[PDB]
Amino acid sequence: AAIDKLVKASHLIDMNDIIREGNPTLRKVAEEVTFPLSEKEEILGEKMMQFLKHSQDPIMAEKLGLRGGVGLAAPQLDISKRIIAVLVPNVEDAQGNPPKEAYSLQEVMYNPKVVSHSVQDAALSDGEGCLSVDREVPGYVVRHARVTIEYFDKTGEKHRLKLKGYNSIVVQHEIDHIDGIMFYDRINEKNPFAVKEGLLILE
Ligand SMILES: [Zn+2]
Ligand SMILES: [Zn+2]
Ligand SMILES: [Zn+2]
Ligand SMILES: [Zn+2]
Ligand SMILES: [Zn+2]
Ligand SMILES: [Zn+2]
Ligand SMILES: [Zn+2]
Ligand SMILES: [Zn+2]
Ligand SMILES: [Zn+2]
């Protein structure tokens, strides 16, 4: 099955393991994982983080044929399980110095969910995209500005975390995949660029 191919020790995830818009797996509600994790679930989560690290490394991305990315969900690999990975790098200053922290967010999350959020909405100014989608899709993807999430790590430890700004937007995009929701479902149907008053537009 797909899981067997992905967790082979020598196998690296690349664009060929990523399913396409139209595949029914992307519209299911993914199945909760149970703890303690199987070996396959543990390995999958590590290969997903490895994919993101490779995607962000100019050379490995070139070698493997990948573009830069900050989030991945197991449904996109044809695995209907509530596992996501997020990797959001901080940026160099104007003199070229590395940031104090390499990443503003770095996690493999099992069974994540939004437990509360702000009344205010937000959206990225430049819209969103998706590895499973090979269409230009314009518009503002309207999300919760701020969220409190819960999730479990690979050991089974529960975490509760508040997020805002770009990290909020990323985590929301990945949780949507495990609920069978696509980014363009949150784009206004008649004017993609419509702005209801009070929308926070992120730059
Ligand atoms: Zn592969
Ligand atoms: Zn169940
Ligand atoms: Zn391990
Ligand atoms: Zn590597
Ligand atoms: Zn609500
Ligand atoms: Zn996505
Ligand atoms: Zn919500
Ligand atoms: Zn709770
Ligand atoms: Zn639409």
From Swiss-Prot:
Molecular function as annotated in GO: metal ion binding; peptide deformylase activity
InterPro entries named among the record's database cross-references: Peptide_deformylase, Peptide_deformylase_sf
UniProt name for this protein: Peptide deformylase
The family this protein is said to belong to: Belongs to the polypeptide deformylase family.
Enzyme Commission code: 3.5.1.88
Residues reported in the UniProt entry to bind Fe cation: 130, 173, 177
Organism of derivation: Streptococcus agalactiae serotype III (strain NEM316)
Cofactor(s) listed in the protein's UniProt record: Fe(2+)
Key words, A-Z: Hydrolase, Iron, Metal-binding, Protein biosynthesis
Gene it is expressed from: def
Cofactor details (free text): Binds 1 Fe(2+) ion.
Enzyme class: hydrolase
